[PDB]
Design a protein around this ligand. Structure first.
Ligand SMILES: CSc1ncc(Cl)c(Nc2ccc3c(c2)CC(=O)N3)n1
Ligand SMILES: CSc1ncc(Cl)c(Nc2ccc3c(c2)CC(=O)N3)n1
Ligand SMILES: [Cl-]
Ligand SMILES: [Cl-]
Ligand SMILES: [Cl-]
Ligand SMILES: [Cl-]
Lengths: 123, 4, 123, 4
């Protein structure tokens, strides 16, 4: 018999992004080919199968720095980190291959699906 | 607010 | 020119609630009249003007235990903590006064608004 | 996915 506030989840995510932009309570640095990205471990886990596996590990859950595979493109990661905190994906002809490869590595199934569909339309 |  | 995934914010919140239910990466205990509630500081800040003020304070941001005012009802807090992680509010005739008072103290404007409206309909 |  609950009532539901339609905009609550969107408002929560908007506030989490405001905390990220002001670097408030960020607890991890993600290193991608020398580029560094500060974030909240919980948000990373909520969006990515890879981060979920990493931060539920009894040893890795305590790390303040995570280094990604050197094949990962920093721009592709930045676009996906922005998507995690906003639901908006900046998908372009010039970045789609790097975004899809990064989303496959991060295990972000819905992003992988839209990249596959956008690539299939161009062939 | 809505009835979910 | 971004594309948007409609269900992303809801899916993030659902995963944050799954982490709460398994006590994963919870970083604070909220004490309400001897009852204890584990939560994520970021989610509390994203939902409540009071927690936002508390955890942006340079001294309080580092506390692992927060004690609420003794007038706060533990059931009212539990209902609001559930709303924070699900967007669903268990509002009933028997709890509405305690829920409204707790939401006013926590500074959760949309909850206060629906409580005022439900109370006004009953008079 | 939608055009926001
Ligand atoms: C599976 S239970 C669960 N519980 C809590 C969290 Cl934080 C979590 N995240 C997560 C796991 C897998 C995947 C994603 C997020 C996005 C995706 O495409 N795959 N999962
Ligand atoms: C105001 S900027 C901002 N930036 C980040 C966060 Cl985490 C935040 N939360 C917050 C502040 C005030 C209120 C709420 C959340 C819910 C409500 O009714 N009032 N606010
Ligand atoms: Cl470390
Ligand atoms: Cl995804
Ligand atoms: Cl403490
Ligand atoms: Cl609210």
């Amino acid at each position: 018999s609950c009532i539901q506030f339609t905009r609550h989840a969107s408002d929560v995510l908007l506030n989490l992004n405001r905390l990220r932009s002001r670097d408030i309570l960020t607890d991890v640095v993600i290193v991608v080919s020398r580029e560094q990205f500060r974030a909240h471990k919980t948000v990373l886990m909520a969006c990515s199968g890879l981060f979920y596996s990493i931060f539920t590990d009894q040893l890795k859950c305590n790390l303040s720095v995570i280094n990604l595979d050197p094949e990962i493109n920093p721009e592709g990661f930045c676009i996906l980190l922005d998507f995690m905190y906003t639901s908006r994906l900046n998908l372009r002809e010039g970045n789609i291959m790097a975004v899809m490869a990064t989303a496959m590595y991060l295990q972000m199934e819905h992003v992988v699906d839209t990249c596959r569909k956008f690539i299939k339309a161009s062939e | 607010w809505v009835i979910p």
